[PDB]
Structures are given as structure tokens and as C-alpha cells.
Amino acid sequence: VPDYHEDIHTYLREMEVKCKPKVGYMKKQPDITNSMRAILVDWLVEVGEEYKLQNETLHLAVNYIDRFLSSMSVLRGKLQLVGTAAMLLASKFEEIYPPEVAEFVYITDDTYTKKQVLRMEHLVLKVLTFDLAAPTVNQFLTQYFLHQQPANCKVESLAMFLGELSLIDADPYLKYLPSVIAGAAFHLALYTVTGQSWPESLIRKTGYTLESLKPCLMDLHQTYLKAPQHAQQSIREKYKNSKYHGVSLLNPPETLNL
Amino acid sequence: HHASPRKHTLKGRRLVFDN
Amino acid sequence: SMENFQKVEKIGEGTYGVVYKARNKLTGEVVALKKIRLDTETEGVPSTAIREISLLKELNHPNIVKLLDVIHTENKLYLVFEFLHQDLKKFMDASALTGIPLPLIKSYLFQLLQGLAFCHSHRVLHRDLKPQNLLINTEGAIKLADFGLARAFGVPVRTYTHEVVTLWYRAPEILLGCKYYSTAVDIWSLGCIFAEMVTRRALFPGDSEIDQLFRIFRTLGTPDEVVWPGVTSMPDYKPSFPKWARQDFSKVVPPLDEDGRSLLSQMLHYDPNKRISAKAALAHPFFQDVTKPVPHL
Ligand SMILES: Nc1ncnc2c1ncn2[C@@H]1O[C@H](COP(=O)(O)OP(=O)(O)OP(=O)(O)O)[C@@H](O)[C@H]1O
Numbered sequence: 001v002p003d004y005h006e007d008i009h010t011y012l013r014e015m016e017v018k019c020k021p022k023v024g025y026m027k028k029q030p031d032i033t034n035s036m037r038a039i040l041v042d043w044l045v046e047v048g049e050e051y052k053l054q055n056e057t058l059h060l061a062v063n064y065i066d067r068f069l070s071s072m073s074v075l076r077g078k079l080q081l082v083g084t085a086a087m088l089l090a091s092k093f094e095e096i097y098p099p100e101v102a103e104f105v106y107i108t109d110d111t112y113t114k115k116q117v118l119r120m121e122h123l124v125l126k127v128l129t130f131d132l133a134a135p136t137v138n139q140f141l142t143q144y145f146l147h148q149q150p151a152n153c154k155v156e157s158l159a160m161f162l163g164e165l166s167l168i169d170a171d172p173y174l175k176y177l178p179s180v181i182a183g184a185a186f187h188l189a190l191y192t193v194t195g196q197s198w199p200e201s202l203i204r205k206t207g208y209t210l211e212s213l214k215p216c217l218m219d220l221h222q223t224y225l226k227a228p229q230h231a232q233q234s235i236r237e238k239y240k241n242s243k244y245h246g247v248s249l250l251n252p253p254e255t256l257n258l
Numbered sequence: 259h260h261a262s263p264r265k266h267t268l269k270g271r272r273l274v275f276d277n
Numbered sequence: 278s279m280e281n282f283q284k285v286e287k288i289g290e291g292t293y294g295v296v297y298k299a300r301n302k303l304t305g306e307v308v309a310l311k312k313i314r315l316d317t318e319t320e321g322v323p324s325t326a327i328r329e330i331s332l333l334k335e336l337n338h339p340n341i342v343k344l345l346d347v348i349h350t351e352n353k354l355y356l357v358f359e360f361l362h363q364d365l366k367k368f369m370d371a372s373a374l375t376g377i378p379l380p381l382i383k384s385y386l387f388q389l390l391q392g393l394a395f396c397h398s399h400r401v402l403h404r405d406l407k408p409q410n411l412l413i414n415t416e417g418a419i420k421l422a423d424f425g426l427a428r429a430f431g432v433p434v435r436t437y438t439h440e441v442v443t444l445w446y447r448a449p450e451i452l453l454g455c456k457y458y459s460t461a462v463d464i465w466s467l468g469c470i471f472a473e474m475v476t477r478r479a480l481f482p483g484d485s486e487i488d489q490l491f492r493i494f495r496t497l498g499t500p501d502e503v504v505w506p507g508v509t510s511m512p513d514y515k516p517s518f519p520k521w522a523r524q525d526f527s528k529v530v531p532p533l534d535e536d537g538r539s540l541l542s543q544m545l546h547y548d549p550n551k552r553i554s555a556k557a558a559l560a561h562p563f564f565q566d567v568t569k570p571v572p573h574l
């Protein structure tokens with residue numbers, strides 16, 4: 001039922017602004033880089049596969065990491081700990097059955113103890129002021145998916161795939177709002193599979209047109225075209241399976257005819 | 259008067275950050 | 278850190294520790310503290326604690342209990358709430374003599390629907406609406422409390438936790454094991470609570486899940502494909518279920534008038550798509566004369 005659909009869309013669109021990291025926090029980090037961040041998020045993808053976690057839990061964790069690193073300075077040797085604590089917090093929020101802490105100790109080859117993971121959870125919690133209900137690319141795609149003409153799961157899985165690729169690359173995707181990345185992702189997926197475009201009904205709903213999604217779109221398009229050659233490969237492997245209809249093996253269009 | 263209802267393929271890894 | 282609060286007395290044993298009533302020694306503010314013992318070698322900060330806080334920090338409304346502070350020690354986590362006189366359950370019990378007047382029932386329902394509507398508008402399911410989780414003050418305000426079982430849903434919903442909502446207040450889509458539930462589950466609960474306010478006793482007081490369904494089928498008739506498409510194909514529907522005729526709805530809660538009957542019926546509607554939202558329910562004629570009376574305490 002549409003009943004509360006529009007209300008939630010507005011509130012998400014309000015909250016996604018407040019839940020934003022800083023555009024270039026990586027500038028002021030004295031020991032960590034984007035390339036490292038990309039190595040962490042790629043690994044967290046594997047973590048979600050091994051435990052069958054929702055894509056949303058992945059998205060949430062990245063958001064927690066980005067917000068934590070925006071205000072806290074971190075050595076590289078502790079970056080996996082913040083990544084782990086994030087995954088755990090996200091799991092507790094979002095999942096019906098979160099895995100136990102021992103599992104989060106395990107997947108890090110015992111780099112940190114159970115206490116370190118626990119003490120880190122409190123830090124992350126303190127720094128995020130307990131604001132963990134962050135809007136995500138996924139929450140938006142999900143909504144956008146209701147506007148399909150008609151439902152096509154290849155389009156959905158592809159958009160999810162595109163939406164996931166964006167978590168890897170701080171530069172450039174930190175510049176865009178989740179709802180924006182989702183606009184481009186859904187349209188690019190729609191276009192790759194059916195040849196269709198960002199539909200009128202979503203113009204009415206989101207305010208966004210194909211012209212305002214333009215800068216995000218052509219970023220994502222290069223990311224999509226370049227995907228096979230990225231340093232990080234977990235997402236392509238993830239979306240090769242039947243669970244995701246093998247979308248990462250689809251032929252991307254060479255232009256978007258904008 | 260009735261309570262509320264309450265609630266390894268991938269190996270572990272230490273991530274290598276080289277640069 | 279906690280030195281500013283003076284514990285006055287105990288106020289209702291809260292499953293991760295006890296719940297006190299306290300006074301801020303400097304401002305004079307009266308508060309309710311909810312202790313959460315963390316220990317050593319556990320599973321860290323509980324997920325109910327994580328949810329209750331984050332979603333409550335987003336829910337600023339006159340009819341939702343106000344979280345004031347989260348005192349965040351490594352040893353224990355204290356939650357500081359605004360304090361209210363008592364919960365609805367205890368209020369009805371000391372009113373089990375001469376009942377609760379209709380202007381006040383009307384007012385309590387109106388405010389609750391307001392608090393519920395704010396929750397659903399902020400993508401939040403309460404999933405534990407029962408009288409002991411609704412709080413009242415000296416002036417006639419009522420508030421949603423206990424967000425320990427709350428979660429933040431998405432559009433459209435996924436499959437969420439099944440073990441949800443206290444039996445007597447649990448919707449029939451949960452009992453039938455459906456793939457998806459949503460906002461309707463909170464509206465089902467309020468309807469039971471609406472009736473519970475009139476008669477002062479539980480509408481559907483079952484002692485098992487099967488007993489709960491049947492109690493509902495006698496009150497509201499056994500649902501069929503015509504009243505609820507999809508009903509006979511739901512995972513825990515059995516073809517063996519006795520098919521009870523639907524009784525005259527005036528007989529469900531006899532003391533309700535035409536407007537009250539209408540509104541309750543729309544709340545206890547079987548199909549969750551057609552169940553009234555908290556939103557729409559505010560425009561129902563039942564609330565044409567809504568006032569804000571003071572309860573006697
Ligand atoms: N802010 C408050 N003001 C007054 N009383 C309160 C407040 N918070 C809680 N209480 C009392 O404590 C009881 C339990 O609180 P709460 O529901 O948060 O704990 P719970 O463990 O989630 O539920 P329960 O204690 O019923 O198992 C309530 O029924 C109410 O009587």
C-alpha cells in the first residue's frame with residue numbers, strides 16, 4: 001500500500017543529508033588512503049557472503065565507517081577493527097540473526113581480541129552518537145524498483161550490483177547522496193537490460209531528472225565499463241551467481257545516448 | 259500476564275595495507 | 278557521571294535490569310532510568326538496546342516517550358527517560374471499579390494514533406503495543422513507550438523477525454506465518470487496546486498460538502478468500518480450521534456507539550492492506566468531539 005510511501009521517502013530524503021560523511025575526510029587522515037578503504041569494503045563484501053547478510057547491512061556498515069573516519073583519525077593497523085565493529089553494529093541493527101562476536105573475531109584471523117572488537121563497538125557508538133538508522137542506496141533502489149514497467153529482476157539485481165560498486169570508490173561517490181547514486185544505478189540498469197529510461201513516475205516522486213543525474217551517471221558508467229579491471233573484484237564475483245542472475249556478466253552499453 | 263517475545267568457506271584474514 | 282541522579286524508588290523490572298525513578302539533583306527533573314548490564318564475555322551492546330536508542334533519537338513527538346540521555350560507561354549503559362505517573366495497564370486496574378469515561382478513552386486513542394502515525398511516517402514499526410507499554414501523566418497525555426522490540430522498516434518490507442508482539446495483541450497475519458508484515462500489525466494491537474480500554478479486559482486472551490486464532494475467528498468469523506484473498510495459502514493456515522460464522526460486530530464490544538464500532542471494525546479488519554492506517558483514522562467521525570480530560574489518580 002502506498003499509504004506511508006511518500007512520507008518515508010521525504011523523511012529518508014531529509015535524513016540522508018544529516019547522515020552524510022564529509023566530502024574529503026580522506027584528505028586529513030594522516031595514515032590511511034582511499035585505496036586502503038577500498039580494500040576494507042571489498043573484504044566486508046566477502047564477510048556478507050560468508051554469513052548471508054542483507055545487502056543493506058553491507059551499505060549500513062560502509063556508512064558507519066565513513067562517518068567514523070570523518071571525525072576520528074585512524075592508523076592503518078586499526079582500520080580492520082573499525083571495519084569489523086561497523087559490520088557487527090550493522091548486523092545487530094538490520095539482521096534477524098546477527099552472527100556472534102566470535103565470528104567477527106574469527107574472520108579477522110585473530111588480528112584483534114574479543115575485547116578490542118567490543119571496546120571498538122562502544123567507540124563507534126559514541127562517535128556516531130547512536131544515530132545508526134542511516135538511509136542507504138539500497139533503501140532507495142528498493143523504492144525505485146516499485147516503478148518498473150513491469151518488474152524485471154535482472155534490472156533489480158543489476159542496479160543493486162551498480163549500487164554496490166559505488167561503495168568501493170570514495171572518490172568519486174562520496175560527493176553524491178545515496179538517493180542520487182540510486183537514481184543513476186536504477187536508470188543505468190534499466191537501460192542496460194531493456195533499453196528503457198528513468199521513468200516519468202520517478203521524476204514526479206524524486207524531483208530528479210536524467211539531466212540532474214547526469215554527473216553521477218557518467219561517473220558510474222565509467223565505473224561499470226572499467227569494472228572488469230578494478231583492483232577489487234568481490235562484487236563482480238558476488239553478482240555472477242544465480243542468486244543475482246549473473247548480472248555482472250551482462251554486456252554494458254558503450255554509450256548512454258543522453 | 260504473558261511476556262514480550264524476545265530474541266567456514268571463507269577463511270579469516272588479516273588485511274594487508276601496503277601502499 | 279551518574280552522581281547527579283538520586284534514585285527514589287523502583288518502578289517496574291525491565292528484563293535487562295531494573296527500572297528506577299530518579300531525580301536530577303541540580304535541576305530537580307524527575308526521570309526514569311533503565312539499567313542495562315553488559316558483563317564480560319557477552320555479545321556486546323544488545324541489539325534491542327542499539328535499536329531502542331537510535332530510533333527513539335529520531336522520534337521526537339508529544340505521544341512518544343522522550344529519551345533524554347544515554348550515559349555511556351564501559352561497565353553499564355543507563356537510559357534516561359522522561360518520567361510518567363504510571364502505565365496504562367495499572368491505570369485500568371485501579372479503574373476496574375467504575376470504568377474509564379468515554380471522553381478519556383477517545384482522547385487516549387486519539388493521542389496514541391498520533392504517536393503511532395509519527396512512527397510509521399519515520400519508517401518505524403513498534404511491534405509491542407500493549408497497555409504496560411503505554412504511559413500516562415497527571416495532565417491527560419498518553420505516550421508510546423518500550424521500543425525494545427521496534428525496528429526500522431524499508432519500502433517495500435522484507436521478511437522480519439517472526440517472534441514479535443505479545444500474544445494477546447498479535448495480528449492474525451503474524452499468527453498465520455506470513456512472508457511479510459508491516460504497519461498493520463501496530464494497528465491491530467491498538468484495536469485490541471481500544472476495546473481493552475472500554476471493557477477493561479483483554480479482547481483476545483489466549484494461552485497458545487492456536488487458541489489465539491480461534492478466539493479471533495469466533496469474535497470476527499473465520500477469514501476466507503472473499504474477505505481476505507491469499508488467506509488459505511498462507512504458510513500456517515490449515516484447511517482443518519473450523520469455519521465460524523462472523524457475529525454481529527456490535528456484539529464484539531457492546532458499549533461502543535456507531536462511530537466507535539465503525540472505527541474498531543476498520544482496525545480489526547482481516548486483510549492488512551485494507552486495515553485502516555493510523556493516518557486515515559485521525560479523520561474518523563469518532564474524534565469529532567475529542568477533548569483532553571484529566572484522569573483521576
Ligand atoms: N519513563 C517512564 N516513566 C514511568 N514508568 C516507566 C517509564 N519507563 C518504564 N516504566 C515502567 O517500567 C515498565 C517496564 O519498562 P519497559 O517496558 O521499558 O521495560 P521492558 O523490559 O522493555 O518491558 P517489561 O519491563 O514490561 O518486561 C513499564 O511497564 C512501566 O511501568
Ligand SMILES: [Mg+2]
Nearest residue numbers: 262409410423
Ligand atoms: Mg514492555
